[PDB]
Write a protein that binds this ligand. Structure first.
Ligand SMILES: COc1ccc2oc(C(=O)O)nc2c1
Lengths: 344, 344, 344, 344
């Protein structure tokens, strides 16, 4: 009865929305209808030209991207770059579920948006990260979703408990490796297979990366102290995956950092704490909506280290969208989002 | 009802079988229960120490592979080296469904089997290739199953429908590239990551790879003529996937061959014919039970060319295992096996 | 005192030429200066913005590709392995040593050329593959070089000693895996890292690959029969590397065939026969101008199998180019060319 | 004429010394000669069996690792599987140049050594990082040399100059990604291509890594305050390369920090300072002995960021090893070591 359209369907995100939408129970029983699949430039093509893993929808024809095609859908995924979701949302009937993978609606501070993105703040919508305290309540039956960035999802999951229990200091370093699908499907020379194979490199360093404020915005959402974030992302030879290594100055004990995480997550179905003597690997969460997380303390340096492993495309993008979609239409949150990753 | 056991749950196959069983719809509604996860290798530990993606079963403990342990199971998965499924099939009730991922019960010729293994021939169970014509009816209600080798699964899918209608000569050549995951978890020096990264090498050439006669066996089943197969495997920097390039001297028009395949596979839900001038790619099938297949004709060389992409671990082993038992138990055969790959 | 210019310096073939020139003995003593570096687009930027691995040259500003800029150089390299260089070559003084990496001057049949390239045939220079019979002689002193394609160099190297001795039939099959760098540096979607990592796809199949007639061409110079080439190329997750699997039916015994290959190759310094029971791998030759070669007989298939492994940018391109530059300036053939690869 | 021996030649470390030795200019003129090749578990096999990339020495036989096999050599490179070569070192003539790629003779603090390794402190020989203040002198004419770890080489090359001019706090964080050739050649189930490919994982975190102290020790040698090291190593899908992300609270403008680096390094030919707007990548330095460094300041977070790239098997092992052995014998430091990488 609920028909959904996808803007950006030819992208990596839109291909991952459509993969999950195809595995959904409400798509098996026909509750959910895959409607119009639109793209910016390849309007006229079949889906199987872009996404040959989506063979069920291979025949589909990709449509232009305007409200003339997105009307009369109940949900609408925008897997768009920024600046487009803002104008496009305003064009759709305010009763339709807009779920935005773009950044346009993530930020609460307008002057912060302006410094990192260079367009005008559209405004804030419910953040698509159910585990974040106070977010699940906000998304229940909501008709707007701003899905998080991939890196902030890894960083908040790794760091927020220990800072929410005031067991670490509100200055955190984050260094996260990520696979090449976070860069997008836009072809450049830095994303050529020959350039990324057999090479790592960090980029947009020393605070300029746009996720930096997102990490701090979500860290400020469980603390009263000023929050400082040094963010460094590294590109590695992998197609999916994000290993976030999170550090902060601490003084509290391990048994208290530990016990605070399993209280935060012992009921969270998608967040998994590694058994003692295990560390997360991106490999283990790939294709799933899970996050493998380990905590430890560096004593000779008085530092808390949290490590976190998500899939940039699932829990960092599309999974988060469908998860928070489920809460938006009252369906079971884990409707269609497995915790078993495809390995090796 | 229907209790399930897995012998050799330590290795790549066991985990993959467990991964499928966890998504099987009979596991949701209870008609299937995951029981003894047995293993000679490291009996005593938790699964998670070996399969950190199967976290619903990370707590389970690896009992050793014993007749006593598999006893009292309505179904026993056997993903171990050759020779031990001959031993253990003899130690279990002839009514228990035995699905063997090993080699023992595949070759219905006896001098051939001793020829390339040095064993002595255990016997012959129905070939778990529900798309080999006739094989579907020999598994509808069976209790003994031998699932195929990964490369044969791909060659015979690429080659049979054209040899079946004798549009090709029975002298076939097949060079197939595969990931490191079909070589097993037995840590050897040449399977190391540093060596297999950035490297492709041929191995077990000049028809001495024990998948050579298994391709033969499948192929005589569709020709009265004299088959001779030149098989070369090549290993490439990937973990899952098989791309099989299969060519043969031909003289029939492309149209005659094209339509033969559309006939053999139009109502095959797992076998997908690439649209005209599209080509299989392993990344599109990985994590899926799909075979992606394309054919053309080399006129100047008067060769038929067939390309077949399977996920080596799903459709080439575990997914076929699961597929056969679906037919064994009179459950729909598409249950718990998807055609949507995980890509990129 | 030889001045050298490279047209196409911002790409892979050009960059690898420069890399071999910087470690050349003639460059170390002033006998070879590195003149102009040109490319179509991106003039005025620095070479380090394209090849940060070539830090000795990183300061060099890239100039426009005109026959002017290229003038006043004793040797000019045309780094266009996928481009068309015939125009320029006939606008430069004919006293210049011209090394064309592209295909324009490879083929000695205008008809074959128009069919596979859709353009007017521009002629036929000495094939820069010194190892093939009577190839090294036409090169000694030559001021015009046609550099062979990566795939062609491999297949030819593994099959010709045996066609030449009439110890195999002239109907050869060649299936070659290659890293993504042979696809050049043009930013196309299907060459992004996300796409090529974890996948393998055959491309341009059924003899529609412009390298098919080149292998036929080079093979025909060693026999009298026509030669029928079934050539299949596959892309694998690697940046460099070519491992060609070459089959052909025979009734020769192996010891005769190995005899052929030792005779063809005992005094060839860039060509290494694998000891009995060893097979080449691509990682073993990356960086080196070497080729690694094995040969076997599938007897139950009456087939002869050869494996060749070379680097697609060294022996398949810049190494051959430089190896034929040494023969063209009367310098030692191995000057600048290592036989030791950079593994792992 | 210096006869050189290599203990543990069949490992990644050893293979990389012999490769560098073959390109050394004193191995062409004959002042250097490759003597014994000791191999613990494979005496009696052919080196080619272990290092198919080293074909000039494929024929050599691997001998048992014994002091008589080595004696009678002017130089002995020690590269044991887990170092711990103090025992064997003691069995050698004091006349001999001993270059230890292990850890036993690295650390100058015997209690530190005991705590991290759990063993006798055997002492400390000159550290093979000629670029460190006052270390190059300790190296001219030495006959003992302790090769530094791959990780400390990069962390100390990214951090020493800031600390040396007192421009950062002495509390430093290091997150370093690395290829699997830094973890040795010992066949283990988590070092398999199927496990590494597709995955990143941090290991031995939060002070547990035996290179945390090494980084701490080299940093102390340049400032008068005391230093803490948060060190986190991350394994990524690559055979070679380390990308070190280094941070510390900042005391200064960036102009002060860049000056500190251009002064410290401008006369170091293996250290390359990235230009305006560029950042280092591991793929630029592969197989060269260069390190590429860039530095920046994150003003919002009051954090300095250094990024360093080196080939772990070259500048973190065999290159430092041969670069030291050049100074041990008064040869030019740069002999046999290029600053040009094998990209892509
Ligand atoms: C992570 O959030 C996004 C948002 C837009 C995107 O677009 C693409 C693309 O590949 O075209 N990937 C995307 C990811």
């Amino acid at each position: 009865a609920t028909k959904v359209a996808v803007a950006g369907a030819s992208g990596y995100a839109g291909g991952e929305i459509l993969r999950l939408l195809l595995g959904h129970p409400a798509y098996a029983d026909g509750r959910l209808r895959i409607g119009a699949l639109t793209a910016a430039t390849s309007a006229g093509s079949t889906l199987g030209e872009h996404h040959p893993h989506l063979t069920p929808l291979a025949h589909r024809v990709v449509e232009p991207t305007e409200a003339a095609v997105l009307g009369g859908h109940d949900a609408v995924f925008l897997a768009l770059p920024h600046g487009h979701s803002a104008v496009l949302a305003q064009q759709l009937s305010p009763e339709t579920l807009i779920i935005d993978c773009g950044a346009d609606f993530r930020l609460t501070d307008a002057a912060v948006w302006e410094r990192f993105y260079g367009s005008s703040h559209a405004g804030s919508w419910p953040y698509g990260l159910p585990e974040l305290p106070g977010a699940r309540d906000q998304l229940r039956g909501t008709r707007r979703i701003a899905v998080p960035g991939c890196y902030p999802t890894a960083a908040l999951l790794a760091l927020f408990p220990a800072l929410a229990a005031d067991l670490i200091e509100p200055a955190v370093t984050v260094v996260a490796v990520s696979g090449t699908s976070g860069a997008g499907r836009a072809a450049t020379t830095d994303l050529l297979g020959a350039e990324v194979i057999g090479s790592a490199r960090a980029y947009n360093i020393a605070g300029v990366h746009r996720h930096t404020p997102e990490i701090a915005q979500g860290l400020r959402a469980v603390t009263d102290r000023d929050v400082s974030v040094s963010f460094t992302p590294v590109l590695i030879p992998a197609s999916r995956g994000i290993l976030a290594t999170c550090t902060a100055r601490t003084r509290s004990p391990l048994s208290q950092l530990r016990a605070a995480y399993e209280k935060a997550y012992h009921a969270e179905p998608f967040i998994y704490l590694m058994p003692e003597g295990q560390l997360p690997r991106t490999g283990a969460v790939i294709g799933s909506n899970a996050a493998h997380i380990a905590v430890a303390v560096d004593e000779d340096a008085q530092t808390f280290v949290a490590i976190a492993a998500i899939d940039n495309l699932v829990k960092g993008t599309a999974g988060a969208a469908v998860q928070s979609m489920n809460l938006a239409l009252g369906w079971p949150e884990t409707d269609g989002l497995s915790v078993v990753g495809v390995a090796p």
